[PDB]
Amino acid sequence: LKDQLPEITDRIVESYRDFATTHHLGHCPLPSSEAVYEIAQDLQEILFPGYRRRQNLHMGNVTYHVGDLVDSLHDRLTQQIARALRHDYRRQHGISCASHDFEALAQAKTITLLELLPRLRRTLALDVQAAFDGDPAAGSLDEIIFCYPGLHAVTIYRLAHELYLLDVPLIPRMLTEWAHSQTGIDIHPGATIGHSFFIDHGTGVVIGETCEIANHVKLYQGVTLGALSFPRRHKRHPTIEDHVVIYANATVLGGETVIGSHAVIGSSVSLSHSVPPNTIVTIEKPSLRYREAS
Amino acid sequence: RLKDQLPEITDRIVESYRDFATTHHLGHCPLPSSEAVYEIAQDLQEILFPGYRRRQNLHMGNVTYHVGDLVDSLHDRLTQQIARALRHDYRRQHGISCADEVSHDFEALAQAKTITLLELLPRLRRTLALDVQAAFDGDPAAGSLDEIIFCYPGLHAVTIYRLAHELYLLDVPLIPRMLTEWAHSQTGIDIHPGATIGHSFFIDHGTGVVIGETCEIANHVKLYQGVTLGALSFPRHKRHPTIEDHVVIYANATVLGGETVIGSHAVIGSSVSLSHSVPPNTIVTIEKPSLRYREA
Amino acid sequence: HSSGLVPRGSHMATDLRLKDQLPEITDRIVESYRDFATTHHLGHCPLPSSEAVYEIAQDLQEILFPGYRRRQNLHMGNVTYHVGDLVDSLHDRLTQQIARALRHDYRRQHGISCASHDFEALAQAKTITLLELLPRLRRTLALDVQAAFDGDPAAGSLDEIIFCYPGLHAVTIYRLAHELYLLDVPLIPRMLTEWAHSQTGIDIHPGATIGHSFFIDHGTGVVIGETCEIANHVKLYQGVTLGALSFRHKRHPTIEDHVVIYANATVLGGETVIGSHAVIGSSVSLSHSVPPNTIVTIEKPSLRYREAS
Amino acid sequence: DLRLKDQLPEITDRIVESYRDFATTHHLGHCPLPSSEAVYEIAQDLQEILFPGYRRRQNLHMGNVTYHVGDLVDSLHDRLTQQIARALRHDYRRQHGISCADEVSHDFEALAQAKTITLLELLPRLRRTLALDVQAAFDGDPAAGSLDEIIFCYPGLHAVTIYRLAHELYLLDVPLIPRMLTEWAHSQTGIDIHPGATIGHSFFIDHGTGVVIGETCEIANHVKLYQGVTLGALSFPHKRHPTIEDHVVIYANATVLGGETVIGSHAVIGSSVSLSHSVPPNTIVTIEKPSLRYREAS
Amino acid sequence: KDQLPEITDRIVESYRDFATTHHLGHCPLPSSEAVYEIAQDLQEILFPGYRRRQNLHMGNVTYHVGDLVDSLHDRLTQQIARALRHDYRRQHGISCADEVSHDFEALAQAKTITLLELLPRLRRTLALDVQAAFDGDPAAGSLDEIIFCYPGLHAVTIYRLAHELYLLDVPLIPRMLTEWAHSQTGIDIHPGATIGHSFFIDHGTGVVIGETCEIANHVKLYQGVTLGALSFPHKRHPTIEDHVVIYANATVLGGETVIGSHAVIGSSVSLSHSVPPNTIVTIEKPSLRYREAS
Amino acid sequence: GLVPRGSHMATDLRLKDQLPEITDRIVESYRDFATTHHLGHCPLPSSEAVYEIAQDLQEILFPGYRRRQNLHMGNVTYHVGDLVDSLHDRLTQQIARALRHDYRRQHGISCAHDFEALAQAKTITLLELLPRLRRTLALDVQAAFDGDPAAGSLDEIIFCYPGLHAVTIYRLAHELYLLDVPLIPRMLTEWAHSQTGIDIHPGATIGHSFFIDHGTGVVIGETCEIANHVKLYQGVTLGALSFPRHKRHPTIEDHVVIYANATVLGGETVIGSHAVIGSSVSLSHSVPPNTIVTIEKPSLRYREAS
Ligand SMILES: [Cl-]
Ligand SMILES: [Cl-]
Ligand SMILES: [Cl-]
């Protein structure tokens, strides 16, 4: 009977006492996943108006739309950042929970992010053009903006990256993993990535925290820019110089691996050492076995 | 008091819209809506697989009402979306800007394409019935047709692809790629709407599969996760492979090139990377890998 | 018969008279339901609901990780209300969903048409079993969270892991699905794991057996088969397949304690055992056993280098 | 502060305890009563069927209306069945002092479905009646713009539509639901019609706020009422409310009381008239010209 | 369930038989819900900070207003056009025909712009109504309480919007608005009524004001007041002059009935003839009978 | 009805260029008429938050009759506990805004746990008296059953009798009034007034076993005092003298019935225990206990229709 339910409830609540690591019970709200996703939506509406939720934006009403989003983002970002800072401070110092202070610091950070939205749009315009240049078959800039997952993942990454530079805990990774969830493109928020970046297809792409990518680089599906199996904090991920292309399913590992300007890394190539500028690296023609099914 | 700087930030953002006009669409001419397109896709799937989607109370005595309503609504919504796609593509091809009255241009043409799509739904069900059976045939361990329809991501991605493909054949801009990229997002399966794919197609697992615009796949084919049917790095014009009937391609294989033909009943083994044709009834496998073993 | 632009009829609006054809389209669609009955479930026998299963999953996660999901205002003084309400609701919803799954499977197993046992009572028993083991699942998942922290040195905190590491999410859903699998619930286990698959690109069959302190880092492209058995303290990376040979019955590998399998490795076969503390390097493809304490890596690849022109 | 939040568990317990002490204003147990929201929803769907094009959907035409109606009928069948069954079961248990542990062995679902089918079957007839009501509003209001304006927003028509639905449920012995319907309409219009009232066709309430019509009241055809009219029972007293014959008009703030009061065919009851006795056909009843006092202001 | 298709068919049949109570065709009438939403938006413009949003300040209110004005332009145009088209067709016995029609659209837009243009003037009039409520209710807590919840103010606000639409010859919509307010307050004001500034209804339940009624400035009414037409009859409703107070349950009837400047109509007074300026009209004390109970 | 020329052209999109200017004139009007806005950084209480609070309180008072139908003794603690927790937060916030705004207004102060703590204390007081309120409301329910012999059941009364809804809201509002909460009490009674046409000032004092039958058009003034076992009908006014805080509305003693459309006026008017005020009676002075007041039989005119 339902008479068992109160007891099951009580055992679960008891388990909150026993295993305290997987709950946050108390008077100190962490940041909200949903609030961070909503922030992300609003930021994207500012960056690509006409391509998101509203389709009735024109020069005569866009100020009202942006103005309202900026006002709301100021409040929401401040709140979420403040909770991230408070929680991280408490955790670092082992302090328990029992417009000033962290709030003011959060607001300062929030305003910095909002102030760089014009600059971000400049950067993102070059990424859009990189997608157009990088995919000859592409219909239009509009198609790219609507639905190229590489552009979406990069957009989120660039927002998360700015917050990373501002020492915001939690929220950068929450943003990148949201994009990762939608696109299968996994970019650490600490990665440094220059303008005119394009990921085509993208599923399975992984880019590590200390990875440094210059301008005009293109990656394909399944590319890993990662750390070596064996032994921007301590550099453990590769540097990719300008105008590099890395084809599908390549792997590039190591904090000292530099892929030089204008290099091409062929499909399925696995590298743990530097490549000179102007080099095409490809796999040896595979040795395949053939048999008839009989 | 610091909220007083927000109006200035707002003005700088609006200014950036003048300076970088390539990444916005401001004006009196709505583009197609991602959300409306998604909703259309939901309604189409309701028609294709009733009893497996949102409603669970459908039977032969009420199904006409469900379908009839969806068909009527889809007529209106697809017409609207497709017309906006056609108008946008017209304006872009001609470099013309947005008019000062509301424009019904292309509405009749959009309606004609919409009706063609709705007319094909019975045929699409026939094809999808074979795909469903192909999943059951292709995965011994499958619990039932029901399980497949409910949650096999391959079937979902292919369903969206087949819808998008019909729109592609009708020269609808934007909407086909919007559909396949939606499916791509949900399944990790990346099928270009331009691909040609015969009946009884099955993708098992599916994450990381990529199939290019020009790829041609015949009947009774099965692929696994991480398969690429793609273009050569270097050496409507055909740049993607042709796969003949009854071929199976195992996990993480790569088949590249517009002149690569994989012959009837061939098997492409796991991790095989090919840029040349394979005759019928050939099993192609990698050379046993050379591995290094050491004590830790 | 001339025009001011390329396609003829560009000026014409929607012809509303053409709406008269829609009833016929509708009738042909309904006819196709008669002709191809395999891809619909029309009748008086609701199958389980995808949406209901998703909602159940949300509520289970709220119980497992309170404070990290939808509510942020939970404390020891109000958590009883939160849990008690969810347990009550889950009891009803899981019973309903499981009962429909059992009924449908029974009918399908036999010939029985929709026009036999007490499936509701059996469903409720299975539901109660699941709810009873939530404290135990919390214990397991606490170790998984710690394994993510240990397995990723660059990890910010337990908090960041719980909030957004996709491996933890996929493993949480899998562990719930697995218990339902062990209770012989049809449909629902795979519905759960495919949901997580869709969200993370991590594909765990609900039949897989996986010990505590399991960690998937990155994870996109991971596939684990039905009969795979993974021990304690195992760590996997993106693109790893633990699958079946191309060329009930065990068809998937066994991975022993403390094994690490790096990105894009493939391990195949029912008889393949990867031994305690082994390391399978990136892109390693194996269909045979490896002893304890063995590090397996690919041979340095043979690469061609030439000038880009 | 947050320390005071520690009192909330205790306040919660005081409330739960009070459910044990005062059981009459709660219904806790495993026997859901009917849902106000579900009844309101049913009413919305019924109105969609009766007045398509004037309610929620604006894209209905002869080519799609079968799908709309077919779907609503199907939904209503399930929801009305559920709501009626819950009402019947509760009323059974209450009348017999049974209680919710003790299983009901009676098939209220089948009976609820039968009552539901009866209501659905008479919707065509109800449309016939309501068509006459709409015309009566047009004929009864000189200033009326169109039938469309009337259908859209005349509160008299809305209250009467709900009443007519509630009345058929009343005649089918459905507990709770008929009064839930009429009270919803009362809430929206100020027009308070008991579901038991008997009202003929071509009925019109103009303005309507403050209208009260009692359970046993009987109104013929072509009757018109204004705001504030009471057709009620005697204060100092089975039929306890008046009978109004055809073609009667009753002006604002009139009061007509008593089970034996018959207002005769084509009578006119003037503004503010208060009556507790019958009136013959073709009689105009008015108040005596009031004696008013006039004084200069300061 | 086997009975249901037949019931469905008989209902559809009855649509053919009784065609006056449906609007089936290709010609959307106006939408009640769209009209209500338009009314919500207009109310937000008229009384910002007292409606749905509570975070409005001088720095963001332009964005809020600007956005609503932009949207209201589109939605009012659409609703008014549908009203004009339907009413014209109906008046002239024209049927729907099977073409999507821009008919009356430009005229609807014109009327819509005129309405939006007079919103500043409406605010000026309503500021006088709010003061009248404060003046007319000496027990009133604050202007805020009045604005928040005095039902007289809400009914008058709706009526004033409806009345401007009535003056613009917009069919259907004005009555839709006043009946909506009627439904929420028990106050029934025909949109055709003429009402001057500083108007106040206190309590209000049961107030009826007729189409041809004319009310001057500084007038106050109470619950249950009827300003109506004669039972035994183009002006059919009374004229109320400046500074008149009409107390609870009074009834004032007739097109030729003029209540003179500064008159007072006492509770329960029933009048069908003019009253001179500066006159206080009261009922004769009732003849009451008293008896001891038992 | 001349249709002006140009009427049938499509919307002219360049006319939207005028909308910014219209917007500016509207904003200007906020500067010119500042009494009818509340622009700034100090939000007032929200109508919708107050309504939601009211819904939650009603769920606590009448569980099984409102939004949830699956409540039983095994789960009701969870339901109530959660509502109380949420109410504590929301009532605290709303009350604090009421108190802050009222203080600023009463003094000159402009906008650039003090009130919060005071708000919380009042919120706790309200929540603590909910069991007592349920006792009182149970008596009101029973008074409706006793006072309307045709009533089907307590259930029906709870489900849909408007008098009981109006009175429920009034009793909640009245407790907030007694705690000197500005704004919110009148917001609550006006909401009830809107749904029922029953208009009760939050300051009214009303004893147990109170029933209003039908109710539309009832008005009860701020200083009115109503004892126990009182019944009112539709259209009853308990109001102030037109030509006369400090008592200006009547006192109604126990067991009084007032029938439809009666008017009782004046702060010194006391209607004695067990009196009956007949339909349409108008009274502006006291009547002793056990007095039955009726109007003289009306003098009516009858004529033949012509
Ligand atoms: Cl592709
Ligand atoms: Cl009516
Ligand atoms: Cl009106």
DSSP letters, C101-165, are HHHHHHHHHSS-------HHHHHHHHHHHHHHTHHHHHHHHHHHHHHHHHH-TT---HHHHHHH-
Quick one: how many helices (H) and strands (E) in chain B? Answer: 8, 15
F138–D24: do the CB atoms touch at under 8 Å? yes
Dist. CA F234 → ligand 2 center (Å): 20
Dist. CA D281 → ligand 2 center (Å): 23
Q: Is residue F11 part of a domain?
A: no
Query: CA–CA separation, F129 vs F136, rounded Å?
Result: 11
Helix B175-187 crosses helix B153-169 at what angle (to 10 degrees)? Answer: 170
Q: What are phi and psi of B141, to 5 degrees?
A: -85, 0
Same-domain check for residues E37 and E177: yes
Query: CA–CA separation, A73 vs A66, rounded Å?
Result: 10
Contact D217, D225 (CB under 8 A): no
Closest CA to A220 of A175, A265, A255: A265
Query: CA–CA separation, F161 vs F195, rounded Å?
Result: 12
Closest CA to E151 of E112, E188, E190: E188
Query: Which one of E99, E101, E102 makes the best mutation probe of the C interface by having the most chain C beta carbons within 10 Å?
Result: E99
Shortest Cα–Cα distance, B50 to chain D (Å): 15
Chain E residue with Cα closest to C14: E100
Query: Which one of F23, F24, F92 makes the best mutation probe of the A interface by having the most chain A beta carbons within 10 Å?
Result: F23
Closest CA to A187 of A216, A145, A159, A215: A159
E26–C14: do the CB atoms touch at under 8 Å? no
Q: B288-292 contacts: CB < 8 A, separation 24 or more?
A: B289/C284, B289/C285, B289/C298, B289/C299, B290/C298, B290/C299, B291/C284, B291/C286, B291/C296, B291/C297, B291/C298, B291/C299, B292/C296, B292/C297, B292/C298, B292/C299
Query: CA–CA separation, D193 vs D162, rounded Å?
Result: 10
D-chain residues within 8 Å CB-CB of E36?
Answer: none
Query: CA–CA separation, C163 vs A173, rounded Å?
Result: 9
R_g of chain F computed on alpha carbons: 25
Chain C residue with Cα closest to D66: C23
Q: What are phi and psi of C286, to 5 degrees?
A: -125, 145
Strand bridging mode F300-304 / D283-287:
antiparallel
Q: Which of E60, E70, E74 sits opposite A67 (nearest CB)?
A: E60
Helix (H) or strand (E) holding E126: helix E119-136
Identity (one letter) of the amino acid at B294? R
Helix (H) or strand (E) holding C216: strand C215-216
Shortest Cα–Cα distance, E10 to chain B (Å): 15
Q: How many other CB atoms are there within 10 angstroms of residue A210's CB atom?
A: 20
To the nearest 10°, report the CA torsion of B31, B34, B40, B44: 130
Query: Of D153, D172, D191, at which residue does a domain stop?
Result: D191
Closest CA to D209 of A112, F217, B88, E33: F217
Chain B residue with Cα closest to E61: B7
Dist. CA D138 → ligand 2 center (Å): 10
To the nearest 10°, report the CA torsion of E146, E151, E157, E160: -130
Contact A286, B270 (CB under 8 A): no
| Number of domains observed in the structure of chain C | 2
Closest CA to B194 of B231, B224, B225, B221: B231
- Residues contacting B120, CB < 8 A, separation 6+: B166
Same-domain check for residues D217 and D270: yes
DSSP string covering A219-285, please? E-TT-EEE--S----S--S-EE-TT-EE-TT-EEE-TT-EE-TT-EE-TT-EESS-B-TTEEEEEPP
Q: Which of D63, D71, D78 sits opposite B66 (nearest CB)?
A: D71
Contact E64, F18 (CB under 8 A): no
E106–F193: do the CB atoms touch at under 8 Å? no
Q: How many other CB atoms are there within 10 angstroms of residue E9's CB atom?
A: 14
Shortest Cα–Cα distance, F73 to chain E (Å): 37
C-chain residues within 8 Å CB-CB of B133?
Answer: 38
Any bridge partners for residue E261, and if so which? none
- Residues contacting C252, CB < 8 A, separation 6+: C208, C224, C225, C226, C227, C228, C229, C242, C243, C244, C269, C270
Q: Is residue F254 part of a domain?
A: yes
To the nearest 10°, report the CA torsion of A4, A7, A13, A18: -120
Indicate if the alpha-carbon torsion angle A84, A88, A89, A95 is positive or negative: positive
- Residues contacting E175, CB < 8 A, separation 6+: D145, D149, D152, D153, E162, E190, E191
Report the Cα–Cα distance between both ends of chain D, in Å, rounded. Answer: 58
Q: What are phi and psi of E290, to 5 degrees?
A: -120, 135
Q: Is residue F3 part of a domain?
A: no
To the nearest 10°, report the CA torsion of E45, E47, E48, E49: -160
Closest CA to F197 of E140, D183, A223: D183
Q: Is residue B21 part of a domain?
A: no
Query: CA–CA separation, D158 vs D180, rounded Å?
Result: 15
Dist. CA A77 → ligand 3 center (Å): 46
Same-domain check for residues C64 and C74: yes
To the nearest 10°, report the CA torsion of E145, E149, E152, E157: 100
Any bridge partners for residue D274, and if so which? D255
Q: Is residue F70 part of a domain?
A: yes
Query: CA–CA separation, D252 vs E285, rounded Å?
Result: 22
Dist. CA A136 → ligand 1 center (Å): 13
C-chain residues within 8 Å CB-CB of B149?
Answer: 39
Query: CA–CA separation, B261 vs B241, rounded Å?
Result: 6
Q: Which of A56, A64, A75 sits opposite E66 (nearest CB)?
A: A64
> What one-character DSSP code corresponds to residue E25?
S
Identity (one letter) of the amino acid at B118? L
Dist. CA D198 → ligand 2 center (Å): 14
Same-domain check for residues C290 and C189: no
Closest CA to F195 of D186, E292, B97: D186
E-chain residues within 8 Å CB-CB of C15?
Answer: 98
Q: In terms of residue numbers, what domain contains B244?
A: 190-296
Helix (H, G, I), strand (E, B), or coil: what is residue A289? Answer: strand
Query: CA–CA separation, D117 vs A50, rounded Å?
Result: 50
The tokens for B238 are 């055909």
Q: Is residue F252 part of a domain?
A: yes
- Residues contacting C163, CB < 8 A, separation 6+: A30, A31, A33, A170, A173, A174, C68
Dist. CA B194 → ligand 1 center (Å): 9
Identity (one letter) of the amino acid at F55? Q
- Residues contacting B232, CB < 8 A, separation 6+: B239, B256, B257, B258, B275
Ligand at minimal distance from the CA of B240 is 1
Dist. CA B211 → ligand 1 center (Å): 4
Query: CA–CA separation, B44 vs B122, rounded Å?
Result: 12
Same-domain check for residues D257 and D175: no
Closest CA to E146 of E196, E197, E200: E200
Contact D181, D166 (CB under 8 A): yes
Query: CA–CA separation, A60 vs E73, rounded Å?
Result: 12
D181: Cα separation from own chain's centroid: 5
Contact E266, E286 (CB under 8 A): no
Alpha helices in F179-210 (DSSP H): 184-196
The tokens for B12 are 């700088």
Helix (H) or strand (E) holding A152: helix A149-165
Query: Which one of E148, E202, E222, E264 makes the best mutation probe of the F interface by having the most chain F beta carbons within 10 Å?
Result: E148
Order of strands across the sheet that contains A239-240: A192-193, A212-213, A239-240, A258-259
The 10 Å CB-count burial string (b at 16+, else e) for F47-63 is: bebbeebbebbbbbbbb
Closest CA to F69 of D24, C182, D83, A285: D83
Q: What are phi and psi of B180, to 5 degrees?
A: -65, -35
Per the listing, tokens 């039955």 go with: F292
Closest CA to E220 of E184, E250, E256: E250
Contact E171, E84 (CB under 8 A): yes
Q: B90-95 contacts: CB < 8 A, separation 24 or more?
A: B90/C5, B90/C10, B91/B29, B92/A140, B92/A142
Same-domain check for residues D197 and D71: no
Query: Of A185, A216, A245, at which residue does a domain stop?
Result: A185
Q: Which of C46, C105, C286 sits opposite B56 (nearest CB)?
A: C46
Q: How many other CB atoms are there within 10 angstroms of residue E193's CB atom?
A: 20
A-chain residues within 8 Å CB-CB of F112?
Answer: none
Query: CA–CA separation, E74 vs A57, rounded Å?
Result: 12
F-chain residues within 8 Å CB-CB of E48?
Answer: 30, 37-39
F-chain residues within 8 Å CB-CB of D228?
Answer: 217, 235
Q: C50-53 contacts: CB < 8 A, separation 24 or more?
A: C50/B53, C50/B150, C50/B151, C50/C191, C51/B54, C52/C93, C52/C96, C52/C97, C53/C97, C53/C188, C53/C191, C53/C192, C53/C195
Ligand at minimal distance from the CA of B228 is 1
Q: How many other CB atoms are there within 10 angstroms of residue D235's CB atom?
A: 17
Query: Of E187, E214, E244, at which residue does a domain stop?
Result: E187
F-chain residues within 8 Å CB-CB of C81?
Answer: 77-79, 81-82, 85
D-chain residues within 8 Å CB-CB of B61?
Answer: 74
Angle (CA) D9 D10 D13, round 5°: 90
Same-domain check for residues A137 and A193: no
Shortest Cα–Cα distance, D63 to chain C (Å): 7
Dist. CA E78 → ligand 3 center (Å): 23
Contact C114, C43 (CB under 8 A): yes
Strand bridging mode C273-274 / C254-255:
parallel
Report the Cα–Cα distance between both ends of chain F, in Å, rounded. Answer: 38
E54–F41: do the CB atoms touch at under 8 Å? no
Per the listing, tokens 């099955």 go with: B202
Report the Cα–Cα distance between both ends of chain A, in Å, rounded. Answer: 61
Contact B48, B67 (CB under 8 A): no
Measured CA to CA in angstroms, residue E211 lies from D141, E84, E191, E215 at distances of 12, 20, 7, 11
Measured CA to CA in angstroms, residue F100 lies from D244, F51, F121, F183 at distances of 58, 20, 15, 12
Same-domain check for residues C143 and C219: no
Q: Is residue F74 part of a domain?
A: yes
Q: What are phi and psi of F264, to 5 degrees?
A: -120, 125
Closest CA to B103 of B37, B30, B25: B30
Query: CA–CA separation, D27 vs F157, rounded Å?
Result: 13
The tokens for C129 are 């079993």
Query: CA–CA separation, F150 vs F147, rounded Å?
Result: 9
Alpha helices in chain C (DSSP H): 22-35, 50-64, 79-109, 119-132, 134-151, 158-164, 166-182, 188-200
Query: CA–CA separation, A145 vs A160, rounded Å?
Result: 19
Indicate if the alpha-carbon torsion angle F50, F52, F55, F59 is positive or negative: negative
- Residues contacting A186, CB < 8 A, separation 6+: A176, A177, A180, A205, A206, A207, C218, C220, C238
Contact C90, C64 (CB under 8 A): no
Q: What are phi and psi of A224, to 5 degrees?
A: -110, 125
Helix (H, G, I), strand (E, B), or coil: what is residue D137? Answer: helix
D292–E281: do the CB atoms touch at under 8 Å? yes
Identity (one letter) of the amino acid at A87? H
Chain E residue with Cα closest to B4: E59
Same-domain check for residues D168 and D136: yes
Report the Cα–Cα distance between both ends of chain B, in Å, rounded. Answer: 63
F48: Cα separation from own chain's centroid: 15
B23–A48: do the CB atoms touch at under 8 Å? yes
Any bridge partners for residue F211, and if so which? F231
The tokens for F82 are 């959660």
Helix C22-35 crosses helix B107-119 at what angle (to 10 degrees)? Answer: 20
Q: Which of F72, F117, F160 sits opposite D183 (nearest CB)?
A: F160
Cβ–Cβ pairs < 8 A, chains B and E: 16
Side-chain half-sphere CA neighbours of E41 within 13 A: 20
Shortest Cα–Cα distance, F79 to chain C (Å): 7
Same-domain check for residues A190 and A253: yes
Query: Which one of D60, D62, D64, D74 makes the best mutation probe of the C interface by having the most chain C beta carbons within 10 Å?
Result: D64
The 10 Å CB-count burial string (b at 16+, else e) for A104-126 is: ebbbebbbebbebbbebbebbbb
Closest CA to F64 of F72, F54, F56, F74: F72
The tokens for D92 are 């059974």
> What one-character DSSP code corresponds to residue F301?
E
Contact B288, B271 (CB under 8 A): no
Q: Which residues of E touch A (CB under 8 A)?
A: 55, 59-60, 62-67, 70-71, 74
Indicate if the alpha-carbon torsion angle E226, E230, E236, E238 is positive or negative: negative
Angle (CA) E137 E138 E144, round 5°: 70
Order of strands across the sheet that contains F231-232: E288-292, F291-295, F276-277, F257-258, F231-232, F211-212
Per the listing, tokens 């759960």 go with: C192
Dist. CA D44 → ligand 2 center (Å): 18
Q: What are phi and psi of D197, to 5 degrees?
A: -60, 150
Same-domain check for residues A42 and A163: yes
Q: Is residue E17 part of a domain?
A: no
Angle (CA) C247 C249 C251, round 5°: 40
Q: Which of C73, C78, C84 sits opposite F75 (nearest CB)?
A: C84
Cβ burial, residue C44 (10 Å; 0-12/13-18/19+): exposed
Alpha helices in chain D (DSSP H): 8-21, 36-50, 65-96, 108-121, 123-140, 147-153, 155-171, 177-189
B118–C22: do the CB atoms touch at under 8 Å? yes
Angle (CA) F27 F28 F30, round 5°: 65
Identity (one letter) of the amino acid at A178? W
DSSP string covering D213-232, please? E-TT-EE-SS-EE-TT-EEE
Same-domain check for residues A63 and A154: yes
